[PDB]
């Protein structure tokens, strides 16, 4: 399949080179996989989700995304026009309030919820969790992310936007999950992106067009935007049978575009998520 006039990040993940505008992908499109978006919620009624999105848990009075961040991230995972895995099932878990903030205790509870809730769901091709969030180092937060991964979910987490080593941030610093840095359309490390040996992969994160609340769209930047590209890619590859939840991060690194990024500090991987799709 081919989507013309695609957002640059989608084109980027199906090309060896930057600057293209067509996203080439296998038509299976993540059908049969599920991705939990652990964030400010998802506006499930947005037409771009085609009914494939639902809220399953909130930690605040409302399940509504009153911010937009979670809706944007979900759209990069699986919306029709802006998503990597256009057929995946999206589950919203609202651990962040409408200002984008959340306590570590709530975030931990939300991860434990996903580990159990996946047993209530039909996800024959596997389960992914996308965590576009984080703060300072916490052993407890890292442990919760490790439990979620151990339970059989492919966990992808944002590296953080501090232009610093991600070893000091959580869940970015947890070794057993997939920690995602951000790049721009010219294959430079995004100026805000964290780095360090704990990073596993980079994904597009500067000027990412996706869904927004009120049935709208907008372009924003962050490692929060790179993370759902990697989560959607994992769901797509699991549907194709090319990897499993336990090995998807390593497989994505195995098959990444290598050495293409600029301004990568010594000690940080130079690897950009790539679907290697061949029509």
UniProtKB/Swiss-Prot annotation:
Q: Which residues form the Peptidase S8 domain?
A: 7-279
Does the record's keyword annotation contain Kinase?
A: no
- Give me the reactions it catalyses: Hydrolysis of keratin, and of other proteins with subtilisin-like specificity. Hydrolyzes peptide amides
Q: Which GO terms describe its molecular function?
A: metal ion binding; serine-type endopeptidase activity
Annotated positions binding Ca(2+) 2: 16, 260
Describe cofactor binding as the record notes it.
Binds 2 calcium ions per subunit.
Give UniProt keywords alphabetically.
Calcium, Disulfide bond, Hydrolase, Metal-binding, Protease, Serine protease, Signal, Zymogen
Please give the positions of the paired cysteines in each disulfide bond: 34-123, 178-249
This entry carries the following GO cellular component terms, namely: extracellular region
Query: Where is Ca(2+) 1 bound in this sequence?
Result: 175, 177, 200
User: Would I find Cytoplasm among this entry's keywords?
Assistant: no
Name any Gene Ontology BP term: proteolysis
EC number(s) stated in the UniProt entry for this protein: 3.4.21.64
User: Residues in the active site?
Assistant: 39, 69, 224
Which cofactor(s) does the record list? Answer: Ca(2+)
Query: What's this protein's family per the entry?
Result: Belongs to the peptidase S8 family.
* Job description of the protein: Hydrolyzes keratin at aromatic and hydrophobic residues.
Q: By what name is this protein known?
A: Proteinase K
Tell me the lineage of the source organism.
Eukaryota, Fungi, Dikarya, Ascomycota, Pezizomycotina
User: Entire protein: which part is shown?
Assistant: 106 to 384 of 384
